[PDB]
Amino acid sequence: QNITEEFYQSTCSAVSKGYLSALRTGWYTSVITIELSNIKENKCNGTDAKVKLIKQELDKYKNAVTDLQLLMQSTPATGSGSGSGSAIASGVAVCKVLHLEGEVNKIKSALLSTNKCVVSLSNGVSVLCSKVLDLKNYIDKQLLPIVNKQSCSIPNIETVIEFQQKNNRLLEITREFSVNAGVTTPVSTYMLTNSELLSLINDMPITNDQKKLMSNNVQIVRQQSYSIMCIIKEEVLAYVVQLPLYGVIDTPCWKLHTSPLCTTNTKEGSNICLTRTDRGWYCDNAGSVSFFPQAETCKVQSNRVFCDTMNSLTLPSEVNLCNVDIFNPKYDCKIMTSKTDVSSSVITSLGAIVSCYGKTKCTASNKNRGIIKTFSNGCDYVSNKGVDTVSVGNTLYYVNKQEGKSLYVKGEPIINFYDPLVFPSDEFDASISQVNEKINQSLAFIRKS
Amino acid sequence: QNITEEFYQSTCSAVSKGYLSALRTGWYTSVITIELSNIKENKCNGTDAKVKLIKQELDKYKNAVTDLQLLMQSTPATGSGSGSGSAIASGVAVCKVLHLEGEVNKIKSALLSTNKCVVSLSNGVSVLCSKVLDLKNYIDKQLLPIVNKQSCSIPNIETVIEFQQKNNRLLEITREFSVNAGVTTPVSTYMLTNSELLSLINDMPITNDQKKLMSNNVQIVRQQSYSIMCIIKEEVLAYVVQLPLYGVIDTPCWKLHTSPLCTTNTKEGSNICLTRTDRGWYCDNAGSVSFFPQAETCKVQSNRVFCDTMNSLTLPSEVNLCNVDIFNPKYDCKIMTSKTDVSSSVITSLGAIVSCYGKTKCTASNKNRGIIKTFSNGCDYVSNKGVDTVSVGNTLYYVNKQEGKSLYVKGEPIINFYDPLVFPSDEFDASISQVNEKINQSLAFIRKS
Amino acid sequence: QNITEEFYQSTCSAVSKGYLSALRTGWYTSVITIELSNIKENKCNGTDAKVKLIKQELDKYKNAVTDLQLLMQSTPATGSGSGSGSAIASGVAVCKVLHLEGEVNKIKSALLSTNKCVVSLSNGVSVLCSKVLDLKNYIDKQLLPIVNKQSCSIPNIETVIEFQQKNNRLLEITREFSVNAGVTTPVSTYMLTNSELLSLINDMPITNDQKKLMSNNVQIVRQQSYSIMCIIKEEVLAYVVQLPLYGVIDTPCWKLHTSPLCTTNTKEGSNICLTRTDRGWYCDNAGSVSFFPQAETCKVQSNRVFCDTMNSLTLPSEVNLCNVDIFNPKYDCKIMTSKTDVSSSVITSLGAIVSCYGKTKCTASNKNRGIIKTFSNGCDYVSNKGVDTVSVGNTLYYVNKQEGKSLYVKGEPIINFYDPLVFPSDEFDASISQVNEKINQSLAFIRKS
Numbered sequence A, B, C: 001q002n003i004t005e006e007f008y009q010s011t012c013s014a015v016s017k018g019y020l021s022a023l024r025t026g027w028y029t030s031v032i033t034i035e036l037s038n039i040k041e042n043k044c045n046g047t048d049a050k051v052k053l054i055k056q057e058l059d060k061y062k063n064a065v066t067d068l069q070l071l072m073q074s075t076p077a078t079g080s081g082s083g084s085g086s087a088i089a090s091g092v093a094v095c096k097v098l099h100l101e102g103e104v105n106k107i108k109s110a111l112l113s114t115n116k117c118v119v120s121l122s123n124g125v126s127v128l129c130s131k132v133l134d135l136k137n138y139i140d141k142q143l144l145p146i147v148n149k150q151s152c153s154i155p156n157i158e159t160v161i162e163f164q165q166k167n168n169r170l171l172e173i174t175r176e177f178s179v180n181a182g183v184t185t186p187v188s189t190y191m192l193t194n195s196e197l198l199s200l201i202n203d204m205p206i207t208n209d210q211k212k213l214m215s216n217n218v219q220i221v222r223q224q225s226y227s228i229m230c231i232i233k234e235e236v237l238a239y240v241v242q243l244p245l246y247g248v249i250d251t252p253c254w255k256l257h258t259s260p261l262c263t264t265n266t267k268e269g270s271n272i273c274l275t276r277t278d279r280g281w282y283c284d285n286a287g288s289v290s291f292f293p294q295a296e297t298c299k300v301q302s303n304r305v306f307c308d309t310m311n312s313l314t315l316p317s318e319v320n321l322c323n324v325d326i327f328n329p330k331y332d333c334k335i336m337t338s339k340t341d342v343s344s345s346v347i348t349s350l351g352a353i354v355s356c357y358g359k360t361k362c363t364a365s366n367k368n369r370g371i372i373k374t375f376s377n378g379c380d381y382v383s384n385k386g387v388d389t390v391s392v393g394n395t396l397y398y399v400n401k402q403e404g405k406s407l408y409v410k411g412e413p414i415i416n417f418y419d420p421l422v423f424p425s426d427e428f429d430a431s432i433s434q435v436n437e438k439i440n441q442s443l444a445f446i447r448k449s
């Protein structure tokens, strides 16, 4: 609920605390079926425009079914497979079951009397079935008596329009499945209406607090979901929707922000830099910390973070000590070094870190008062309380207007504890104790000779 | 207007000059409203197909409004926030104002008599208002007399069709806003027709030369714009369109192309490489140079470059001296080094740089004459005048057919001025003077022992 | 057909063999035309709803043509240009020909009598022409007699509906071309129906085995295609479709998987790591090996790999010896080193490599038996035969269920042949023989002093 920040002048890094967690750890597969009509082309003596329009829309239904047929002749399993495996792997497991004999018949039988069921497949997976569109009922009852005879009966213009409305959702689903090789993400309203999604959430074998969680963030749920095309078989079109399951909930999370920490010598060519690494989202997870390096693997909405553990890292709970004591031996606090003194800025949750070097004009202004702070050479921070923009050189960043308390922790910049001459000025991903050992090694290389 | 190129044999790099500039430095927010109809469901005795079709399309209007309602219950502010801040930050500032009382009433009053207005909000922002669709007028005048009574009146088939045409734009806007969590980019023709966009450009408080600039490049303007969902309130649907403002215009720009510069010893394992860094777009901006490292942050159309300063860098105007004298002390000309002699090629604006090493078959051919040039070991360049393709190994690159003059600047490759034994063969982002100091340091490590 | 795997305990890497190849080496351009109607607005005394609906849909046709007109006033050539050149370069060559006089007349004449032709342009390119929609015929025959007179004739509701159906494909094509600046990929069903694509494949001057190849993988073909907007001219709308040409077919391919290989000392701060580089897809191509570093540049479907040679590398056929003998001098087998002992896992084609270090809980379980293997410190591998998931820390990966034989090649991990004290613990992209020379250099730096 209450968001806070802490800027560490000593390491040129800030930590935004107070966020609650929702980590994806599992998948809920669910089958979405469309009852289709097995009709073959029935060309009849037809002339007046109502039969032509009906026959045209019927051909769009036929090409949509044959397009779905060449789509299932190839199950590419193209979703993920990026060394972290497939994400859709779980949903693919349901499609291989649907290809079994009698398996399309079980969901077709469970949905013989009701629209929404639960079906126990022949592999132990209890999936929830949904039937979102019924074209077999409409084509076999309202359309076949028009095209079945020798000469076509004249359908009313109302039938032509009602048939374009029902057939539309099928046509759009085949269009998405065609351009994406059967696997789509996010799940569009054609794949699942907000109304159908909320009905699937209410029926899940999950706690009521988790149903309130997923229902208040349906947009986040859509963006973290997959729609996988299954099978066209026995007057039934089936495709699987994989919805995220959040195994870690309401757990502490914080966000690390890092910026270069250089020396401010006036001699060009004589400055050395240092930047804490592993910036990003950290969350408590099962006695450890789940770290998320990729920026888009975590969507944040309203004080909670929605992450996917597929692309994360597991760190000891001691990783937090780099935020309070970077010189602490329980944890190997890693940095990267260079001699590149370029000014830059990072917009944090409650303020902005500014690393200003050289002649760069770094400043922070308010919309109505103008410039309220001019930064000197070095690394600094400013709160958003009273600040609107931060400009560094020719670049203007907008400060985030989130409410929260910020705390400035004064301290000596650690780049000053290093002798410039005996410094590793090209180490990437080096630990503090690792760098102290390389400094002990270059000073041993100068003492002996 | 006139595009030229310069290849530097000494550093294996080329510069494409002559481009004019258009840098995004600001945002213009504008409110786009849709007048809605506050109706509640009115189930009536209905049987004949025209009432059923009308009631179906009316339900799609109702679900679209409730879907927009759960979308504004969560303002995620998910656009950007990538350490450069939010891009949509400015547009979000307008949405927080719309949630104020009386604020939906001001734009609703300014648009009470005209379609397009200007409205001064209660926070000092003078936004331009547009009213693109009027469903309150259509539902309350043409539809309510059909559904208001006890039994429904029979609407003509013309009313059913005209209502599907007007309601369509609302349905597509909710579909885009649902899959993208309220923030879309680019701005589609459903969000804003080319006709409405041109009318917004003509009304902006900008110079006439800037209106000619944005109007001749509307496609670039759409791709650099954002559509942010605001509020559903008081029979008004409002969402903000953020259009780019180009503060830097008709300013000099050039593009740096770099390729590995290795030695051509015949001994495998004995070659060292060097590659100028910071390749990309450079533009004069306010006495400095704005450098763009990311490739997609700059779209080039017809001799002008359209960049976003949010992801750029500010460099001293002296950065140009790496293109004429890399050994010049006013600027720290940075390179990266390695021992990886792999052949490769870079398609420039007017030609192609080819770095050929080992047994790789590097060649450049014309469509009707065949191979017109065979490259030897080392780094070379060829103009597009008479050249169609360049093949390196099993890879074929197409040479850009842009008209312009190319200039070949002969010179000794600088990788030959370095003794291989005493070379830093793993430096990344190192300056020329930095490398000379490391060579002075490894030669001091061999002289003393 | 038969997929196999080989895990090398000595280098912590695995190779998935048995895949067949389809590399894109060329482009087939083809022109897709829409015959348009040159009509100007003809406002007439109109009141009853059928004329209003017709005039509304006619205005959507007019704005679509003018939107296409400002789209061709700017040919941005924004597709690619990423230093590998443009991909669309070949297709752009056809658009510059269409702007020639008489050139729209040749395809318009070849398609005067048939729907599908071949046309020899005035630049030697024999392109295949397709005419997918005929609006000039429909507007000039069925619509002009209604709007041509002084007062409008009353069209039937059937005409209003048939005109919305034909005009729809034009409107969707302008919507895609507007948001993407004239260059779209993949090619949607609006740009080309699966039926039109299959008819273009059958007519190509390619072998019958290649037509069977592209027809069985149309989804892969769409995802690797481009649609480029050409010209609006002389009652003809033309745009070019670039389809991939696979010059390398049924050639051997394998996939390299790599994972960190560290020492298992119990002392924190004392471990050194090593990881083979250049992981990805390798395919035999013209006596060499085409290597693909980017992960998305190769789509794999059903034992064959579909790669684009534009973003690839050419390696000596000897690159395979890093998979059997990394210490072999014919090839410089490159690695990268560090001191970062973080546990991680890689899902291979037939199993999973697990690098477990520190206190991380690495394990592999079966769905019904539970944990079937607990990994110790070091690098290991497990087959998918009997294994369902692999968990490392708080991350759970799904093992790929592809059928195939796996082979575990036991051997001493090479990180143990290196003395930790005299190790380059920050080399990136270093060769084995390069590292042995740096170890010979740091041992010479300690022997002399």
Ligand SMILES: *[C@@H]1O[C@H](CO)[C@@H](O)[C@H](O)[C@H]1NC(C)=O
Pocket (backbone or CB within 6 Å): A436, A439, A440, A443
């Ligand atoms: C090297 O490490 C030893 C062990 O702590 C210490 O006594 C010595 O002062 C260090 N020398 C340096 C950091 O130059």
Ligand SMILES: *[C@@H]1O[C@H](CO)[C@@H](O)[C@H](O)[C@H]1NC(C)=O
Pocket (backbone or CB within 6 Å): B436, B439, B440, B443
């Ligand atoms: C090292 O730098 C000094 C100062 O310019 C110079 O005199 C000397 O020749 C250099 N030695 C090298 C580059 O080996």
Ligand SMILES: *[C@@H]1O[C@H](CO)[C@@H](O)[C@H](O)[C@H]1NC(C)=O
Pocket (backbone or CB within 6 Å): C436, C439, C440, C443
């Ligand atoms: C250095 O290389 C030489 C040449 O093969 C070899 O004899 C010597 O043992 C090496 N020394 C090392 C690897 O420490």
